[PDB]
């Protein structure tokens, strides 16, 4: 979800 980078 958010931040987008913090999810695979």
């Amino acid at each position, epitope marked *: 979800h958010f931040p987008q980078f*913090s999810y695979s």
Partner: antibody
Amino acid sequence: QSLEESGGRLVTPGTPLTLTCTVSGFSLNNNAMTWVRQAPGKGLEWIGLISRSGITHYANWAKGRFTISKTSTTVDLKITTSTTEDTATYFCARVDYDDYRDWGSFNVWGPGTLVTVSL
Amino acid sequence: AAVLTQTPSSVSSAVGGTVTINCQASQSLYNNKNLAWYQQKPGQRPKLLIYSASTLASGVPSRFSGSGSGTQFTLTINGVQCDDAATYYCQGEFSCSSADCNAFGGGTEVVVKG
């Protein structure tokens, strides 16, 4: 507040390379980082990034040959197998987002380190 | 995939002229407006000029501005100076789930005529 890349050198095609970005003035626990390269006379090209909690994201072109890892003060880029087309200056940069918004940009850059993949 | 088509590839402007550079995204950007612009003096690292399409970054003169949303974005230099001779790049953020998270435009070399 400053970044410094190291590890650039002459590389024989087909062999591995590790670059390092040493961070001064903030912790990577709180700051995402990215690698970008630029072949001589060519444009900037995004390689990949690592989030604060260690999630990695790569450009499709790079997946499976480039690996990013980090400590709280350093971020590395490993090239599995190098080829001539990897000849470039490699930059590390801070990725500008926090827990409230993502500004989208890379707002702190190192000077770059030069990689030469060549016989 | 996701790309930014940056035009022109090169341009020459007299001192005091105006230069606008265009970036067209092949799909909508993350947050609709997460397009940044960088200046790169020859042999030097990139420097952020504009982010979020229109926000002037730290240490950037007021003659630089940006505009756009969705897929069409521009950078304008209003009253070009000799120091503005450089290569400029746009950079878009995309949804990582559907494309590469980021991409750059191909650059624009700006020559300033003194």
